[PDB]
Structure 1
Amino acid sequence: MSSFESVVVIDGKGHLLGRLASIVAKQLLSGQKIVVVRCEALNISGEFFRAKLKYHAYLRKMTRYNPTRGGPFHFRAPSRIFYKAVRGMIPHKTARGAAALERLKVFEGVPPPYDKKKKMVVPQALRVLRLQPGRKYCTVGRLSHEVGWKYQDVVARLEERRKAKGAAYYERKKLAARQLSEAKKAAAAKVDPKVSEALAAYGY
């Protein structure tokens, strides 16, 4: 509904890379602060050897005299691949583009500051909503691991720990919801019939 927030956190799982990058870039240039998690869980349409071939051509592309300066720095992390897409989609060689890049943050996995915050999702880039069911797709985590990313296992272990903590949190949440439903029934008896009928007519 075109809502403005302090910062929107996007769970990158199940998202198509280019479409999520487009939406994120437009939001950054409009003035929204964004934080993207699970870039390793991001998806790319097509087949894995197509993505790997594209990345290997990218690796071919290299400066001749001195790779240390000026050369195309090939980043092997999924967060940095997503950042490369967003940077290519915004004018990074201007102060406004630099400002948008400073409103953008990206991570692998879900850091502990963001594990307790609400993770949003963009329908316009969801794989299950965009891709035809029979088509093939690949994951940026697999691509990064096969092109030289060194921290796939550590991220997997941290995600497993986070999900165990989330399971405990969800047990507590279920207990709280049961208590809330019970109290609402008990209290209903001890509420004025007029308040209830009035609220029902008003739609609450």
Structure 2
Amino acid sequence: SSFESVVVIDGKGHLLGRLASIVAKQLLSGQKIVVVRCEALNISGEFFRAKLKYHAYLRKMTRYNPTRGGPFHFRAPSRIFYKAVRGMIPHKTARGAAALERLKVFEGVPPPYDKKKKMVVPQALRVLRLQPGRKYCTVGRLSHEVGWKYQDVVARLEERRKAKGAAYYERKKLAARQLSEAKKAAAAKVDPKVSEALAAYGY
């Protein structure tokens, strides 16, 4: 338990409801959250059942005027995740409104938030919660078929980003190699007793 300034959650491999509940507690506490890669969340069950649940959602609409009041059905993966979170917050009060202002959700990895450290919530990871043998789906596929347009744009944009992040990895490996080899050559030069003193204290 700690209080950071802003924490960045990587959405790939998490469960929709089991992540919204964790995140919705943090917002009301006073934390700031940023969810990235919502195109790659997960839902338990089988894909066809997710369709049926969503089609039953698309049927609700105000009768006398479909341009006011009626449930507006957003189609993007971030907006699906955002709807889940808004369910778990008293969003009709000033306290709830303020809490929602502390959240940001995107597709892909926008410019400000790449080159940062992405956390992981192990109380909602799929490979840890679900039982081997059952089936699951992906919000990305679900949203594409209910009428989301920008799958291929975000697909190829992500490909470019991960290509840039390969030369960077080689620099890190080079930097580590130099630090490790320097330690082996410098430890023996001049260190009569400091070494044993540190080793006894546990370092």
TM bracket (short chain): over 0.9
Cα distance, 1:190 vs. partner? 2.1
CA apart distance, 1:191? 3.6
2:39 match: secondary structure: coil
Secondary structure of the corresponding residue to residue 36 of structure 1: strand
Q: Deviations over 1:174-200 (max 9, x none)?
A: 111111111111111124131111111
Q: Flag the 1:191–1:3 CA change in 2: closer, same or farther, 3 A.
A: farther
User: How far has the Cα of 1:115 moved from its partner?
Assistant: 1.0
Post-superposition shift, 1:140?
0.5
Quote the offset at 1:77 in angstroms. Answer: 0.5
Shift of residue 149, structure 1, vs aligned partner: 0.8
C-alpha separation between the residues in 2 aligned to 1:102 and 1:190?
A: 56
Q: Distance in 1 between matches of 2:98 and 2:192?
A: 57
* Residue of structure 2 in register with 1:122 after alignment: 121
Gaps of 5+ in 1: none
- Name the CA distance, whole Å, in 1 between partners of 2:30 and 2:112: 22
Once the two structures are superposed, what CA deviation does each residue of 1:154-189 show, in whole Å capped at 9, x if it has no partner? 111111111111111111111111111111111111
Cα shift readout 1:122-146 (whole Å, capped 9, x = no counterpart): 0000000001011100100001101
SS at match of 2:137: strand
Write the deviation string for residues 56-88 of structure 1: whole angstroms up to 9, x where unpaired. 111111111222221111010010000000000
Equivalent-residue separation in structure 2 for 1:203 and 1:68 (angstroms): 68
Structure 2: how far apart are the matches of 1:14 and 1:170? Answer: 23
CA distance in 2, matches of 1:134, 1:63: 42
Inter-partner Cα distance in structure 2 for 1:196 and 1:149: 61
Mapping of 1:1-204 within 5 angstroms?
2-204=1-203
1:91 and 1:18 mapped to 2: Cα distance? 17
Rounded Cα–Cα distance in structure 1 between residues aligned with 2:17 and 2:125? 11
After superposition, the CA RMSD in angstroms is 0.9
SS of 1:138 mapped into structure 2 = strand
* Distance (Å, rounded) in 2 between the aligned partners of 1:179 and 1:140: 43
- Following superposition, the deviation at residue 94 of structure 1 comes to 0.8
Kindly report structure 1 stretches of 4+ aligned residues shifted beyond 3 Å: none
* TM-score for the superposition, normalised by structure 1: 0.97
Normalising to structure 2: TM-score of the pair? Answer: 0.97
Question: Take 2:31 and 2:71, find their aligned partners in 1: how far apart are those partners?
Answer: 29
Q: 2:39 & 2:137 partners in 1: Cα distance?
A: 11
**What secondary structure does 2:86 align onto?**
helix
Count of residues in correspondence between the two structures = 203
